[PDB]
Symmetry: D2
Subunit: 303 residues, 4 copies
């Protein structure tokens, strides 16, 4: 019948001193809880294995590297995959990826989709990196993603995960219609990812009180206009003196929010998902083939 | 000058037999009221000179042709232009455009921008035509725009209207991120247009109660993600037995709705507009040149 | 830890010819589904055993009486109670109650709370009856609740249901702050009920497009201002030619909608409920004892 | 006359040393701008003449006293009244009222209504005082209103202001359904006031990201359920190192927001107001006399 139960595993803060073993325990706990509630897939936050390190300027490269994964899964994260396979619940995990290619230490803000058999189905590397590249004194806390990561090199793919077409986005990506549209054009039925969104923005603080609004607006508009179910898992709460936005959510292809977290701690929410619901949009008001006039969208792709 | 006062002139229903002279009287009234309240520009609905004729299945070309404009403006509509120049308030007027080229008729769902001097400074032709192509007996009312209009051939231009960079969308266009983005990439500070949106949709009636939601969601998301002020003028009310959506609105570049109509009759709303407000988005979170990666958006422009 | 999983069992239309046995099958199905997802309690709609008969004017008293329950549970509804006890999931059921007292045939729009042991814990009879008392020709469909029911005679009680303080409201009641406040003052941690809300209102059709908005606004404001979790189960869809509002929901004590249905058919939604969350409001911004000045609210209770 | 144009004059921060003369200049500017745009009444913030002093723990009564008004208006504030009479635009002004009775000081958080003739036609004193009573060291800023003000002693009156029945609320009051209902029962057509709402709350910081939501939710629900136009004027921005909420608004009796500010500085918004619109609610769904059952609301007035 093409139905399933989707879950979002919101994370509370992760301390700089908090170990990966300790984080995995928290992830295993949420995954198990989701499974008990019938979930077949659970979405975890962006960079969900450590504290959001981009908030600090590093001078020691060994220290910076400590926040990156060189294996996936490694012995420490392995338990999550084993449990996922055991309980038959896939997941989307975000983490910092360090890979050496041709003499270059490549760093990506990454996310992976694992199916209900514990097998990695696909990867995505954050294409829209927000923030800045150089330390900025006027900021109460940094957001050096442009310094610690390079734009993703995998485009915006859509993978078959347990009979569901799933596309991945990572945090800031959710605000760009292009990311949603490319995956929408690739037939995504579910577009999911996580985020680390401070409720304070140094560059434009006059938008602080609109942090939730902008986050939900992006999720709802993206889902609706592409007729795709969506889910966003944030890492929220006061993490290392920086308040992070909560309001993790699951959204229907109509843009209707069907599930929303209300705490700023580890929290699991779930919602029944009918993949055929996407047709109400993609076969009608948003029947791409019947209505789109791409001959007029060229500027969007100009370099 | 970077400050101005924008207005929206929502229309109540226009009867099948209501003359353009009578409609012009209503338009003049709203333009006059808007100017008295400081507005120097007012947005009117899509096809603001006639009843929404695409709701009927025509069998006589002469009857169909009667709903189109062969000149803009003709003697009947000219008074609106004269008053706009007198009071110093430009406008966006929607209408059905009939052009005869070498004995061949061309039909467009059109909108024009007139500056505070009463001069036409730009035209746009609806690119995204909603509805169906053939008569469908089950529908209480049809929506045969695909038959009565050709997709626009002017692309999504942005024009300078009295020191303001303005782009035009027409009804359905507002639901397509591509329309907004093209104009966003062309630097539009204001994106505006009108609409005739029935609160009932025959093919997907399960979205009827979401009519306001989808409309406002599209306007808010479009404004926010392109950092553009926006305005949507609807023709609402029970027109020829078909209930049309109201909730005409003016929206800030943050996506915040600053003005909204509450009736289903002719109604004017105004909002102070600072063209520099756009910078809060376009020079930061949505600084296009700094964050976009167009090399990965190619699929959006593929035919 | 004072936690539980609350569910809402939205109903699709119930035909005039649809039997109670057939309705009970649908209710049993949702209750079972909820239980499988970990729900300890499920809220069903107002008058959930029959079609919304108040929409018709009856001349035959025997026919009117056919829609009322004279027993609760009777042999037909008994299965629901048995299953509730089996699976350990309580519920809130709405139905038309007919009881003869002192020679008077009393009719109430009623709802009952049954605990996880299948035992009826408390009853509530609708105090705010909307609509009219006499047949009204100008209406496309009637809403004769004032004719078929008499205002409830049990006040707005709050009962202990499996260690949770629960208050009941029935449809229109949710729009009156007095109903919420009385139960709020009685310590309700969960305020729940169901509804039959046509998306069309004959008296004031200009509010039709606001049906969802007003319903959700009432649920959110009631929850927030009383620091109570809440849930509303509607019977939606096209029932006997009258479209009924969907958007069944579960709301947190902060007023945040945590679960929302998206179809207009039988649909189950669930949300984790922490009764202590009520304290975030009732012990602070809405600490009644510390902030209320009842010496100034007298007019609210004047006859 | 049943038509008018209502305005809201939102204030940006008022410094601790900013004089009343300087504040009056800002108020005159907004009143003048509002009138030029057709407004015949403008709502100003709570304590609109000084910085929000309740944020500090005072130890000197003379310093505290300096923030209160001993006369209304005194020579400094009089110019505002004169301009209101000149331009024909009344206003709602909030301020700290200090009264000396038989050698005894009485302190109130007050608001007055002045008609378009510049005459004071009504007064209200804040009944719901938020915050705490004793100094709390952990808080970055205090909120000692319970110490610097006595709960209002005028109840929730409704006054006739230039053919409009208006009621007053002050900040926190807007979150209490009782305040709105009393004025609703007294027939208010417009319920207005101002507010100083920090976007951060020390005791319950987990609701910080919901500050706008709770504010707007309270205004929308209050208007809808009492069928009253409403307006809330906030003093927003970073005032003395404390960020205050913006989103000043004008709301229709349907609960629909018709105007909203987007900056955190002095800002004027206006909306056309039809006093008869109230009837859409008060003569139908919320026809008090026809639907209310006050005999069951007694608990709300119990001391
Ligand atoms: C900094 C914030 C604007 C950005 N955060 C992120 N992790 O990508 C976001 O778009 O959520
Ligand atoms: C029919 C409706 C869906 C469509 N109306 C329109 N005039 O384009 C719209 O997009 O508003
Ligand atoms: C008719 C509608 C206004 C009313 N319906 C109801 N069943 O009580 C309601 O308040 O939901
Ligand atoms: C402190 C805040 C919660 C309160 N402020 C206020 N001035 O009354 C308010 O209710 O807006």
């Amino acid at each position: 019948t093409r139905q399933m139960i989707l879950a979002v595993g919101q994370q509370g803060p992760i301390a700089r001193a908090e170990t990966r073993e300790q984080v995995v325990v928290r992830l295993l706990d949420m995954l198990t809880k989701a499974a008990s509630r019938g979930a077949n897939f659970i979405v975890f936050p962006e960079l969900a294995l450590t504290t959001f390190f981009p908030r600090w300027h590093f001078t020691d490269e060994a220290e910076l590297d400590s926040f990156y994964e060189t294996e996936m899964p490694g012995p420490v994260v392995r338990p999550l995959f084993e449990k996922a396979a055991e309980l038959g619940i896939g997941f989307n995990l975000g983490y910092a990826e360090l890979v050496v290619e041709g003499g270059v230490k490549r760093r990506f803000n990454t996310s992976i989709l694992v199916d209900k058999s514990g097998k990695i189905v696909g990867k995505y590397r954050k294409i829209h990196l927000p923030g800045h590249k150089e330390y900025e004194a006027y900021r109460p806390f940094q957001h050096l993603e442009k310094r610690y990561f390079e734009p993703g090199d995998l485009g915006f793919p859509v993978y078959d995960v347990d009979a569901a077409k799933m596309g991945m986005f990572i945090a800031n990506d959710r605000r760009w219609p292009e990311a949603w549209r490319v995956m929408g054009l690739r037939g995504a039925e579910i577009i999911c990812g996580g985020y680390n969104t401070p409720t304070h923005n140094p560059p434009v603080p006059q938008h602080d009180h609109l942090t939730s609004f902008h986050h939900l607006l992006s999720m709802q508009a993206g889902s609706y206009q592409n007729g795709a179910w969506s889910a966003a898992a944030g890492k929220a709460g006061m993490e290392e003196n920086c308040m992070l936005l909560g309001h993790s959510c699951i959204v229907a292809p109509t843009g209707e929010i069907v599930a929303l977290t209300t705490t700023l701690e580890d929290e699991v929410i779930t919602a029944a998902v009918d993949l055929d619901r996407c047709r109400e949009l993609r076969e009608h008001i948003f029947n791409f083939k019947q209505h789109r006039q791409p001959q007029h969208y060229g500027l969007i792709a100009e370099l």
